[PDB]
Design a binder for this molecule. Sequence first.
Ligand SMILES: Cc1cc2nc3c(=O)[nH]c(=O)nc-3n(C[C@H](O)[C@H](O)[C@H](O)COP(=O)(O)O)c2cc1C
Ligand code: SF4
Ligand code: SF4
Ligand code: SF4
Ligand code: SF4
Ligand code: SF4
Ligand code: SF4
Ligand code: FES
Ligand code: FES
Ligand code: FES
Ligand code: FES
Ligand SMILES: [Zn+2]
Lengths: 92, 642, 560, 156
Amino acid sequence: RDCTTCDRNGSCKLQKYAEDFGIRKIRFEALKKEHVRDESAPVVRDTSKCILCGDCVRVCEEIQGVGVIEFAKRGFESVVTTAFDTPLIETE
Amino acid sequence: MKIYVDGREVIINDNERNLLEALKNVGIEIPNLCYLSEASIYGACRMCLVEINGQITTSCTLKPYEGMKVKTNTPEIYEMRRNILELILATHNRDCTTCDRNGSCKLQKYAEDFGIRKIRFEALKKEHVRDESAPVVRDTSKCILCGDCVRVCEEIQGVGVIEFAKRGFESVVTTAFDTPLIETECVLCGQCVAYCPTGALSIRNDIDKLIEALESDKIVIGMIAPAVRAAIQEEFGIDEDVAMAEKLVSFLKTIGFDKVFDVSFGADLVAYEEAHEFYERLKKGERLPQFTSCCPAWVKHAEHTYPQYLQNLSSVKSPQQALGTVIKKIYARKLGVPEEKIFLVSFMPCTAKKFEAEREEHEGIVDIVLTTRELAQLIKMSRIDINRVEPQPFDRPYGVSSQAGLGFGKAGGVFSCVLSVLNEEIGIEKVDVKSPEDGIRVAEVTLKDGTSFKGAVIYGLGKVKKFLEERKDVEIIEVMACNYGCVGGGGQPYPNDSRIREHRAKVLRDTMGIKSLLTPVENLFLMKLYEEDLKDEHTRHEILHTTYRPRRRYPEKDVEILPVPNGEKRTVKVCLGTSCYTKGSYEILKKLVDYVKENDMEGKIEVLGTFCVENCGASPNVIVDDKIIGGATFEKVLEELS
Amino acid sequence: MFKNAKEFVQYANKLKTLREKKLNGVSIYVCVGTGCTAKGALKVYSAFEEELKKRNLLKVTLNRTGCCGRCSSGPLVKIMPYRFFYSNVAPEDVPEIVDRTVLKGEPIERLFLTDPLTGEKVPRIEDTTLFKNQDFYIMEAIGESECDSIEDYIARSGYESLVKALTSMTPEEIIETVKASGLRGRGGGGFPTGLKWEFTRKAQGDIKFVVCNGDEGDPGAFMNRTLLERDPHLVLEGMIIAGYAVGAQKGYAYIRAEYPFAVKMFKKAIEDARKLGLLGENILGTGFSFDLEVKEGAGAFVCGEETALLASIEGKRGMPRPKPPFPAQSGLWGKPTLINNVETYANIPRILRDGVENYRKRGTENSPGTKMFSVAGPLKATGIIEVEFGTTLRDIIYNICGGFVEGEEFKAVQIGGPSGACLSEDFIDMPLDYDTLKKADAMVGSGGIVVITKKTCMVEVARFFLDFTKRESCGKCVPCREGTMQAYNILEKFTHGKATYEDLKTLEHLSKTIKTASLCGLGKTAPNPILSTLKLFREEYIAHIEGECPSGMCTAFKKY
Amino acid sequence: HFEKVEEILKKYGYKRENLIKILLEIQEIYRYLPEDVINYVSTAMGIPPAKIYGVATFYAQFSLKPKGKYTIMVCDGTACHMAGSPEVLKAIEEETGLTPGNVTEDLMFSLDQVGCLGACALAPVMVINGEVYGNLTADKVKEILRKIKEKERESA
Ligand SMILES: Cc1cc2nc3c(=O)[nH]c(=O)nc-3n(C[C@H](O)[C@H](O)[C@H](O)COP(=O)(O)O)c2cc1C
Ligand code: SF4
Ligand code: SF4
Ligand code: SF4
Ligand code: SF4
Ligand code: SF4
Ligand code: SF4
Ligand code: FES
Ligand code: FES
Ligand code: FES
Ligand code: FES
Ligand SMILES: [Zn+2]
């Protein structure tokens, strides 16, 4: 939850619901996730903002035919990433 | 006056204070973080940089002169503006999802527009303050130190409970000694929140309690304030709408409210009671001038500032408390259900009503008070088109009200309602209204028999002091803590400027216009309530009357050396003044500290420090069990401790 | 003298006679100015008191004098009939002084002043090479003037200029002569004082104010408090003359509460002047009224700003505001206010007594007069010195201060504190002036000087100055409040040997923002040390980025 | 029931222009600015407490915590800083476990870093209850702190 330095700031559905639902506190603990940040390529990845909707995976595979990003691990550790967390500039 | 902006001819205005305002009037916007509300000033953000004659300067403090060449956009100015914004954002608590200004924050919009995506500066730590003890919540980690709240509380509200403290990186807007806002002289008017451009000042959200109550087996009963229906339409980007209250009733019933009532009925009841109380006071010529008690912020202000006028305050409780007590004590019996089974929800435009509902004299009557913004959040969660909602009337028997009752939502409402009640009981020959100042109105009222009085209406706290000091020719005074009355309350939708408040007052006037019955007595349900329930004066007093007590700070705030959080102890306090320090005081303190270092395994002894005890010239003074010793020394404090 | 100038002249002449009578006899002066008292000047005065009383031979007079410009040379004492100068006067050898000198008069070689240049001992300070190398115009009668005596000041021709201005001249001609003299603001800006007086006088308003800025504007300078403790009546006379010139009926002196001696001395001077009639409802029966009051400064560097000073005097937080409207039109409580430094007011009566040509004989064609400084750092002779506006850094450092201590070399010099400049050897041979060096990225400043040696790290100097500025910022505007702290963080990163080139570029680009976008002068000059050291000592910053510190002190990497 | 404070307020006539001087006097009397005392001053002068708190926390001479029995005043001026003041501060910290602006548990020591004391010839310079120790080093600072600790501990 750091919207000032986000590209979806002002055009984020989650931000709009957080505003509308009146969420002013979180009684749920901010559990620690093995988040992945990548800045090697012009396309920048940051899994700490990911809601795991899966749209990017479908876009890359079905629409673009590359399929370089895909769901990895499972449960609370579910993450959309590249094979072996390889930097994007080093993949296909 | 014609000027050149970026090389094109521009006509600004004949006489202007500064280049920034002149260009804004033209329609040329210079980014800045100084103009944030009506209580804003210029000079702090430093983001309005323009170039003129080679040197860069702020446009908010530059006088526009004819034939001036100003470049508002140069690479140097871009670099400087981005640097300033990054400086602001580096130390700003950037959690917008849980912020109360999310989606309506200028700083957030600038961060979006300036493409700030990384913080080149360190997010350095400050000694931030987090005050959640009052319905007004303070979080200085989101503060941009614009100073609008200070000016609002001092120049507009006249309380001055929040001020700038420290300097430099530690600069913070706070109360004295970081005291919790609940324990200060704060009246909880919420105007600082209404003017705050960030989430630093916010209202305590209580939606979770409402949801858990609705989910339970209790009978949830809601009542809406007159000024809530005149402003809720702003949150959805729609224009004025009469019948807003009825579609609000429809929505509330849809989400699980068993009964929804109108606080305007309580307003009419309060006006009736206050009219009779005021008439008795006049005919006896005692306890004058009278003060209305409908504004809890004004009540708390009087308790803090005018302990002598606490007997002149109206005994009648506010419409919220009056109607809530009526419900809990009469409607529950009429429904044959225990009072524990009813959950009373109050939808108000005021942050001080949250405090009033928690007052020791009103305990257990109103369960939760939700502001207009919180009701708008409730509507937005459902995602229903409230515009398309079919209206339905308020539930009976507390659903109908008179035009005078609905007039309570704006300044001059309770006085007008009282005047209507008096006119109906005993005609009014003529009312002559004067306007000494912007927010002060004085009326000259003559009754049919010949007994006349002067009643004054004052909206906006901070105007009360001068009027009470210089004017003694009135018998009844209406005080509203917020400008324009409750239409500009702390809990109203943001922004909450004066133009929006005037539009809200116009909307409330239009809503009043469609009311058939004009005075409280014409309200048949109200006369019924008196006939079968409030017949005798004993129950009427126990139901519609309250008491007021003075407020004075009780601060001990003495130095804590080796404190004990709780439990039976000895609480030894050592004087630390210069006179006592002159011989032995600090050395005795060292002896006691070492004694409790070797002895006093438990919290039996509390070595404590206190300032001068007004016993100078009598040797070092050490307090024991709140007793004076004089000539204190380690052996004497020991034996007394024995 | 409480009626007209004739009795004042009679009083002054009789006091001159009395002063000459006392001087011809045996008398003692102990420098009780700051620095000497730090070394035990008060104990020396007490020793003289007790020794001369137990022997009970007081026709000797014991007096307290002000700073004599040799603060480092121990407590300072001199006997008048034979003007011998004593240094490092321990309280233990005072009986020796009384026995050997006061009664007989034998010179004491062991207790004289050394000479750093020629390496010898001279009996008299007036004959000392350092004394000759200086130019004393404000500092008069060094070591033989009573700070706590209006009587002595009058006996030294003091207060004559104010009488001349009142009885003879009119405010217009006073302002004209001040403008012609070319006196420039000593606070550091150098703005012509005559123009400021004209601005204040021409301002529309019956009631006006005169304010004195006692602050040194530097955490390493003590020139202003030294001047105040030396001759409080000189500053008092300057303030009264300024009030008469600009038509003010009220004056405010702003002295830090941190200086008990200066505050007490100025209060005593004001009380004495009021008692003698120089202040009150009617001064010298000329129809002109004026009073003065000392306002204690609770301590805030930002209070040296004009607007911040005005806010502090009124009892508020010392918060500056956009300068226009200037204080010369709407200052204290909205009334016109004249704000000048202490040394400016000290110069005023000196200019009035002398002429314009005589005043301009010293200095240059743009900056006539003298400049009192305060040299510190490792040097043979440190303290308070006065030089004309034509000297070079080398003259002060070596010829006047005697040079560096054996085993210590010159690296750089600070000339204006945090807001000043960092000058290396390349600019040492530049004549001090408000214009000659104001264009070469430098400034004479308020008057503080500190010498930086080869064993001093310039990155550390920048970090220290930025830490000072970060602590001193009032927190009103974003650039100063935030950027000063961020720059201090970056400099701390450099100091701890964990900085990078990106940090260097960030600091460089943030300094320009701080300098340009800041509201007042505190933030505008906040990055002056960073810019100075970057322009003159870039290789040291680069070395720190490589974990070297060629000066080798930053305790961040060693013995690995 | 405040008497000396009332005397000061009457002396300066409840004028806010004299607020800083009043606070100075009150500090010299109480050794600091207690919350109760300035609440009383606020009530007497008709000025909100927040204003007095803002003024008090803006200036350095005002302290909200009691001064130590031995108030240490270390010079942080330019000459003193380059002469080894950080070493003096580190020695003070490692000997008494405090940093500038803090006080010890038993109020025995308090520390403040201030500007030039006018004795740069003695750089680094330290002041303790008006006693100035010049040409200080870590060894000397520790020696003098230990000596004063023994002297006070004696009590007698
Ligand atoms: C942070 C700061 C501190 C200052 N300190 C002083 C000072 O101590 N003495 C002084 O004369 N001017 C000081 N100044 C400059 C004055 O605010 C301003 O120049 C004033 O007009 C002095 O008048 P003068 O030029 O006649 O001396 C300071 C300015 C700033 C921004
Ligand atoms: S799953 Fe893919 S598209 Fe969806 S939020 Fe995460 S990164 Fe974005
Ligand atoms: S005030 Fe709230 S919404 Fe605005 S930037 Fe800060 S956290 Fe985000
Ligand atoms: S709620 Fe009202 S009284 Fe309280 S701090 Fe805000 S503006 Fe001041
Ligand atoms: S709390 Fe809000 S209104 Fe007050 S200074 Fe901070 S940002 Fe401005
Ligand atoms: S005027 Fe109305 S909204 Fe404002 S504090 Fe009083 S009751 Fe609340
Ligand atoms: S530059 Fe610094 S001292 Fe000057 S007004 Fe801005 S924050 Fe205050
Ligand atoms: S608009 Fe903010 S400083 Fe000019
Ligand atoms: S100082 Fe202790 S009783 Fe006053
Ligand atoms: S204070 Fe004594 S010579 Fe300077
Ligand atoms: S710099 Fe410390 S006494 Fe001068
Ligand atoms: Zn270094």
